[PDB]
């Protein structure tokens, strides 16, 4: 039992900038035998630094692991768009073997507001008796955002289903979907269906709503 914690959890950065990813050995002196494992989403992990001090062969010298035995850092002095990833640090000094909660490389950019569009349930869906009010909060940077589904002025958190893109490959924004799924009965017993999106780009929620009585 030895714990590692790798800070931050994510860093929004310019590519080529130096974003150093800290780590620490909670126990003993781990000394050497810590690593850095880059795992991009949907990948097997990829080992970067070994003994906390040494690159693997494939990983270029931009990656630098550093720190000794109670504390550690993963540096990339030129973090890259190719370096966009999830990085891990792994104490090997003892079994059990474990992994610190990662740091992510996000590419910093202009802050973008979500394009927010609240589509009532398709008439196709309404004919099924189910009603899902979909609110698509699109192209926002950073990912910091929240959905609030307001119903007849009484905010409903139920039937809410959220699905959002990641840092968006072209603009590096994020896009989000907020789906308010109602029984068409309660969909019809209440009228104003309001998704409002608060985002670091907006001092207030970005309000997108429909009263079914409207069209």
């Amino acid at each position: 039992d030895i714990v590692l914690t790798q800070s931050p959890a994510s860093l929004a950065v310019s590519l080529g900038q130096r974003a150093t990813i800290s780590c620490r050995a909670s126990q003993s002196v781990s000394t050497s035998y810590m690593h850095w494992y880059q795992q991009k989403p949907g990948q097997p992990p990829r080992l970067l630094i070994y003994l906390v001090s040494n690159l693997e062969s494939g990983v270029p010298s931009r990656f630098s692991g550093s720190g000794s035995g109670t504390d550690f850092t993963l540096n990339i002095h030129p973090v890259e768009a190719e370096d966009e990833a999830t990085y891990y640090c792994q104490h090997i000094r003892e079994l059990t073997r474990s992994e610190a909660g990662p740091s992510w490389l996000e590419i910093k950019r202009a802050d973008a507001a979500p394009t927010v569009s609240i589509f009532p349930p398709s008439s196709e869906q309404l004919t099924s008796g189910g009603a899902s009010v979909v609110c698509f909060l699109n192209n926002f940077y950073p990912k910091d955002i929240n959905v609030k589904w307001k119903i007849d002025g009484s905010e409903r958190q139920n039937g809410v289903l959220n699905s959002w893109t990641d840092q968006d490959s072209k603009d590096s924004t994020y896009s989000m979907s907020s789906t308010l799924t109602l029984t068409k009965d309660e969909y019809e017993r209440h009228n104003s269906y309001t998704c409002e999106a608060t985002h670091k780009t907006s001092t207030s929620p970005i309000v997108k709503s429909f009263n079914r009585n409207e069209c």
């Binding site: 990948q43 792994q90 090997i92 196709e124 979909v134 429909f210």
Partner: protein, 218 residues
């Protein structure tokens, strides 16, 4: 080249038994500790354990002790994690990892995700999601596709046969009652809708259901 290759991602049900392969390549199998690391779908790498490659002797983390069978085929250089009594917790991406030992694990199985759960293959409910007055953003009418209630993933959600890539944000399908719903959204200019057809084309290879719904004005 040393490459750790594993079995394929597998749908499973609770109570079952899975054995994920790991085949060694490009190195002498015997000489390196074969490791196993659980990446839960949301969780980071949680190291499952290691089986001694020389002896064939497994070693498990206190967590992974007793439900999980590390096994090593010797000649063909294949490693195995066999999970017994499959549980919805056993749903996760699993990685064999070759020990450089006190230097940890260098390489990794290409990944194998077990999905342990009851549901049966189900077609999606594909809903063309039309914009309303507020859903028209600038020149753009944001449009949407509600792909609803299918097991398992994925569905292939394209837009007018994918001819709409850019304004599209196909949002992640997540579990609903062990069925999946994704609400996919194209952002098209009000000039192109509904003047040009916007039809979200949703193919679900598991259910073999390709469902194409044109978004039409409400």
């Amino acid at each position: 080249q040393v490459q750790l290759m594993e079995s394929g991602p597998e749908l499973k049900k609770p109570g079952e038994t899975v054995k994920i392969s790991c085949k060694a390549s490009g190195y002498t199998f015997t000489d390196y500790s074969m490791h196993w690391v659980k990446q839960a779908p949301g969780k980071g790498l949680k190291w499952m354990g290691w089986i001694n490659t020389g002896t064939g002797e497994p070693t498990f983390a206190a967590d992974f002790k007793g439900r999980f069978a590390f096994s090593l085929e010797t000649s063909a250089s294949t490693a195995y994690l066999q999970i017994n009594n499959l549980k919805n917790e056993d749903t996760a991406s699993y990685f064999c990892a070759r020990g450089v030992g006190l230097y940890g694990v260098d390489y990794w199985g290409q990944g194998t995700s077990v999905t342990v759960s009851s549901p049966k293959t189900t077609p999606p409910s594909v809903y063309p999601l039309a914009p309303v007055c507020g859903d028209t953003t600038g020149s753009m009418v944001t449009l949407g596709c509600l792909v609803k209630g299918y097991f398992p993933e994925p569905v292939t959600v394209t837009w007018n046969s994918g001819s709409l890539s850019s304004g599209v944000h196909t949002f992640p399908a997540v579990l609903q009652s062990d069925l999946y719903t994704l609400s996919s959204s194209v952002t098209v200019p009000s000039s192109t809708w509904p003047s040009e057809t916007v039809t979200c084309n949703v193919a679900h290879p598991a259910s073999s259901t390709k469902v194409d719904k044109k978004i039409v004005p409400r």
